[PDB]
């Protein structure tokens, strides 16, 4: 039988390899009367265990880095010699939270339960309610639509600590990468008043050995 846990696992394994990898992420945010400069990042992803997110553009931000160990983030900034702490749930840029780039998987961070099934045309979806295990994960509640036919993630709704809809995402531009048809675009839309939409494009995904010993403040002591 399919279970909520297995559905979530399958969707996670479509989104990303369940392995250590590198990927580039370009994030373009705009709202009708205001656009952001393009942001680009290189991500070294080791599940939900460890990651490094390095900003490459814009130039004003280049060189900042985020080190994740467990649920804790250390952020390296030019105004301080030692890194500082931000949370997974805090804002990266636009409609993107730190955890949206730094985490790999929903599994382990959320307890899944089937909320309902939905048909949107000739396609049926499982709608999973993902309850955050605790207040340090990225969200307290996510609703995730997973295609029943192939377990692909379809869209998500992200809720506040008090149950207000904050934003929505859509998974798009599926391509054959490392054993799966994986989404290479995610669109994150504000559900509130800003009019912002952030478009995240993933490129050059590749498996990479990421030793535990790179996930340290010393590894990130750089100046270019």
TrEMBL record:
Native species: Nitrosomonas europaea (strain ATCC 19718 / CIP 103999 / KCTC 2705 / NBRC 14298)
InterPro entries: LolA/LolB/LppX (IPR029046), Sporulation_related (IPR052944), TP_0789-like (IPR033399), UCP028205 (IPR011220)
Keyword Signal on entry: yes
Domain Uncharacterized protein TP-0789: 47-222
UniProt KW keywords: Signal
Entry protein name: Uncharacterized protein TP-0789 domain-containing protein
Keyword Signal: yes
